[PDB]
Amino acid sequence: QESISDFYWYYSGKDVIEEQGKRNFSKAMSVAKQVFNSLTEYIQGPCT
Amino acid sequence: GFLPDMRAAASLDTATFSTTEMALALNRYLCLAVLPLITKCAPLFAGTEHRAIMVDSMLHTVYRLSRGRSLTKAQRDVIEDCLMALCRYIRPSMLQHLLRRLVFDVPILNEFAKMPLKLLTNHYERCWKYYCLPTGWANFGVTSEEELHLTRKLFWGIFDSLAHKKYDQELYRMAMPCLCAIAGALPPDYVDA
Amino acid sequence: LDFLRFAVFVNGESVEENANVVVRLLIRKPECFGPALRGEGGSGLLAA
Amino acid sequence: SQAARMIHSTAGLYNQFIKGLDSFSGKPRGSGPPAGPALPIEAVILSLQ
Amino acid sequence: ICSCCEEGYVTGGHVLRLFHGHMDECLTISAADSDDQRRLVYYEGGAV
Amino acid sequence: ALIDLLGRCAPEMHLIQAGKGEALRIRAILRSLVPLDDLVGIISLPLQI
Amino acid sequence: VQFLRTDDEVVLQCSATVLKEQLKLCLAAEGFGNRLCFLEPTSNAQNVPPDLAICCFTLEQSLSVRALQEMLANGHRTLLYGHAILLRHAHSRMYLSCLTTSRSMTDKLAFDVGLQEDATGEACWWTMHPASKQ
């Protein structure tokens, strides 16, 4: 999340995100999606 | 820190010490990071009357460093380029010593005489209003009569030397622009005492 | 020092990233400057 | 509160300046400077501005 | 310092006036350039 | 060697005219490391002809 | 386990040891007629009370490094290491900053710290780093 926030802060000034930035964002968001799915799996069952 | 070292190298230019390791080191140091620095700061030399006494002196040694021996082709080209770039922005009334020194060898049309007369025409084409027009060049006064006699003698020396020498294509079409520039610059009705 | 200047300077130009990193490390460790250019020492270039 | 704080600081600084001025009054400096401490002319100028 | 400060209650590092019960006077030092050289406190009140 | 290394670590002129904050900071640091007086004095030192 | 937060009063205190005696001093500046700061000793308060009226500072704003760079190009938030902060004097309402005047002679590479009227520029922002390994 900190890395993604830094990337957003860097790219905020630019008007249009370039192709490389879009690819990096897609990779980071896919990794974050997998981590979120694992976190959901850890607590999907009512594990107190 | 700059001029004294050039003077020391010019003293070291003699054939007795020309092959010395220190002489080669001094030549290498002069060719790099100091002479190109002078080339870069050449336009800043405009209006250098206050230090004119030293300026001529430095010009002097520069010319010597361009005519010295034991110099690589690249080093000689660097010194010649520095001389031309410097003389580009120097007021013409300051350079009379330069041409009075050049007339030592420029009317000889030797191997080392191609660069000097090239420096002549480029100057005389730039400062043609200094001599031809009765009013002096812009921001400058009227040319001294000594300069007029000097350039007349230079023109006649080049003319008769080229008259009495064998034909050389490169030398001929290098020296012809200089003769044309000198003829154009010096007024037609000049009379020398 | 020769290796550092080889890394910093390439093809007659200076790489800003490498130069900034090198200068950051150098200022972070003043003892790299020796007895001279030292706050505690203060010898001076001409004196040295 | 701010006005009182600047009043206190200004009063102290100007009292120091007045004492410094009165230290060498009536005695020419001559060769060496007066034995009193150097007048805080920079602080006085900055405070006045 | 003021992390545990609460509104409406007196705290340290505060400048304030000590008014009496009738509120017409308060603890004041002597006037400027006084005989006692500002060493005694009085319940003057009024314009002070 | 140290002086040469610090010299070639200087930022480019185009960055200086661009007004980049990092380039100005680096140039200020380099100017703070050594002064001009030392440079001119050491250049003025003669050699063993 | 309380954590520092923005928009609150705070005092910067150092710790020196001279003649096997521990002295605690705090940074303080006047701000009116004198910009330079100095260490006033907060120790030995029983014998002599210190002047703490010019020792209070306020954490005006904390920001990230890249956010600070972007804002320079253009809620009690918790403070964490690696974040720039802005310090403002409580009395003079002038921000602490690193001036370009080098008044020391022992260390030639040492600048001065003082109060400045405006918050513009990068000289008034200070980055925090963890002193300990923990």
Swiss-Prot record, chain B:
Post-translational modification, as annotated? The N-terminus is blocked. Channel activity is modulated by phosphorylation.
* Protein's cellular compartments: Sarcoplasmic reticulum membrane
Q: What does UniProt note about where in the body, tissue by tissue, this protein is expressed?
A: Detected in skeletal muscle (at protein level). Fast- or slow-twitch skeletal muscle.
Tell me the superkingdom of the source.
Eukaryota
What free text does the record give on domains? Answer: The calcium release channel activity resides in the C-terminal region while the remaining part of the protein constitutes the 'foot' structure spanning the junctional gap between the sarcoplasmic reticulum (SR) and the T-tubule. Pore opening is mediated via the cytoplasmic calcium-binding domains that mediate a small rotation of the channel-forming transmembrane regions that then leads to channel opening.
Give the multimer and partner information: Homotetramer. Can also form heterotetramers with RYR2. Identified in a complex composed of RYR1, PDE4D, PKA, FKBP1A and protein phosphatase 1 (PP1). Repeated very high-level exercise decreases interaction with PDE4D and protein phosphatase 1 (PP1). Interacts with CALM; CALM with bound calcium inhibits the RYR1 channel activity. Interacts with S100A1. Interacts with FKBP1A; this stabilizes the closed conformation of the channel. Interacts with CACNA1S; interaction with CACNA1S is important for activation of the RYR1 channel. Interacts with CACNB1.
What's this protein's function?
Cytosolic calcium-activated calcium channel that mediates the release of Ca(2+) from the sarcoplasmic reticulum into the cytosol and thereby plays a key role in triggering muscle contraction following depolarization of T-tubules. Repeated very high-level exercise increases the open probability of the channel and leads to Ca(2+) leaking into the cytoplasm. Can also mediate the release of Ca(2+) from intracellular stores in neurons, and may thereby promote prolonged Ca(2+) signaling in the brain. Required for normal embryonic development of muscle fibers and skeletal muscle.
Similarity comment text for this entry: Belongs to the ryanodine receptor (TC 1.A.3.1) family. RYR1 subfamily.
The misc remark on file is: Binding of [3H]ryanodine indicates that the heterozygous channel is activated by Ca(2+) concentrations 4-fold lower than normal. Single-cell analysis of cotransfected cells shows a significantly increased resting cytoplasmic Ca(2+) level and a significantly reduced luminal Ca(2+) level.
Please state what the protein is called: Ryanodine receptor 1
- The organism's lineage? Eukaryota, Metazoa, Chordata, Craniata, Vertebrata
